[PDB]
Structures are given as C-alpha cells and as structure tokens.
Write a protein that binds this DNA or RNA. Structure first.
Ligand SMILES: [Mg+2]
Ligand SMILES: [Mg+2]
Length: 231
DNA sequence: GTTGGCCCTGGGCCATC
C-alpha cells in the first residue's frame, strides 16, 4: 500500500552546480518539469527493439532558470555544463535568493497535491543541495510539503524486472547509461538542466504505469532530506 | 570523484557537478 496516497504531480528535476559534494557546491541552473499523473497513465508504450524515444505529454509546466553562484565553478563543472560564474554574472543572473524561493513556491502551487520530485541520484545530490540552498533563506521552504524519489532506484527495479541479461550482472545506472540501454541513442544536451530533465522524463516514460506505482510506493517527505552541508 | 555514502563477508561499489 501507499504511505502518502497517489502522487497527483510528478516534478522531474535536475540541477547544474559548481562541483561535487565535497566542494560544498552551489546551484548554477535548475529545471522543473511538472507532469500530471493522468498524462503518465495515458502514455503509450512501444514494444519496439529499440523503442522510439517517447514524446513529452502535451500538457506540462516547465521552469528553467540560470542562477549566479556565490562561488566559482570547478574547471570540470564548467566544461561539462557550459556555464561559469563570470558569464552568469555578465548576463545579470541573480543568486539563489528569496525571490527565487517565492518563484518556486508560486510554480509549485499551480500543481495538484500531493506532489513528488524526481531526480537522478536526487537522494545523494539534488535533494540535499536544494535543502541546503533553501535553508539559507528566510522564506519558508517551498518544498516542505512536497515528496521526493530517486529515479536510480526506480530504474534499477524496472530494468531488473525486464528479462536478462544482466541476471545478476552489474551495469551502470548513470542517466546516460540507462537512456542508451533503453533507446540505443546518446542523450542530447547533456549536463544542461533542461536537457537532462528531458532525458530523465524519457527513461521514466519507458514503463509509465510501473514507474508511477513505484513512485507512489517510495515517495518520502522532502522535509526529511538531510542538507548536503551547513552554514 | 580525486569523495563518501552505502552494502558486504578493512574493502568494494559507483553517481551527482
Ligand atoms: Mg543531475
Ligand atoms: Mg544535469
């Protein structure tokens, strides 16, 4: 049974940032793609080998923002994301501030509840980092009433259900690895927030109903997510 | 990941930017 009822909204989420967790990173870009449960329930499965990449539902809400970090990106981070602190400031990007939190709140309020965030390795990166970024602000966390799941665990379950191999053979569950296994194509616009969100949506549309059920079964409160680091 | 949070039977696995 379900610990928090049926999720009515799935918000696929990705961030770009200044580096990996040990660097105490800051968000440089974020993308939200909100899809209603019904749009997933009515997603048509293809049984092709490989199946074609599914198209996103007609009805979606999308938000994509570039964000000026308080610290510089690592050379690696810059090279893969195509972003830098200097260039973001040049183009007048504002920081992760109260106005952004208010922006996120209004966007989230337009989505039916309960709502569940979906992010690849979200449990170990995206969710803790958002918790940290939002905790810095006086604006109450816009995500405090929302739930969240990690799509890695989701896809491990779904792929292992599909017949072998592996059959106990280990494989990568990186975003790109999954996408390529499922669709035999390289993902496009890699390590851009919107690009990776669309990639995430695609692998989540591989088995729409099975994913929805898994999400409903494993959704936990975002309020329970430990911040990546502290002030 | 160059880390570090997991799972395992002092180490191996492996993903986010
Ligand atoms: Mg990501
Ligand atoms: Mg990304």
């Amino acid at each position: 049974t379900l610990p928090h009822g049926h999720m009515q909204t799935l918000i696929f989420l990705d961030l770009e940032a200044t580096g990996l967790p040990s660097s105490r990173p800051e968000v440089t870009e974020l993308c939200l793609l909100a899809v209603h449960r019904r749009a997933l329930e009515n997603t048509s499965i293809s049984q092709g080998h490989p199946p074609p990449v599914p198209r996103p539902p007609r009805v979606v809400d999308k938000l994509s923002l570039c964000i000026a970090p308080g610290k510089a990106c690592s050379p690696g981070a810059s090279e893969i994301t195509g972003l830098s602190k200097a260039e973001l400031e040049v183009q007048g990007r504002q920081r992760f501030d109260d106005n952004l939190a208010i922006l996120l709140r209004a966007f989230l309020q337009r989505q039916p509840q309960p709502c569940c965030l979906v992010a690849h390795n979200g449990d170990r990166y995206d969710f803790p980092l958002l918790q940290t970024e939002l905790a810095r602000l006086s604006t109450p966390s816009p995500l405090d009433g929302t739930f969240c799941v990690d799509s890695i665990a989701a896809l491990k379950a779904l792929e292992q259900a599909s017949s072998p191999s592996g059959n106990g053979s280990r494989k990568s569950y990186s975003l790109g690895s999954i996408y390529t296994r499922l669709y035999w194509q390289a993902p496009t616009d890699s390590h851009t927030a919107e690009g990776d969100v669309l990639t995430l949506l695609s692998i989540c549309q591989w088995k729409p109903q099975a994913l929805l059920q898994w999400v409903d079964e494993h959704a936990r409160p975002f309020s329970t997510v430990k911040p990546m680091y502290g002030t």
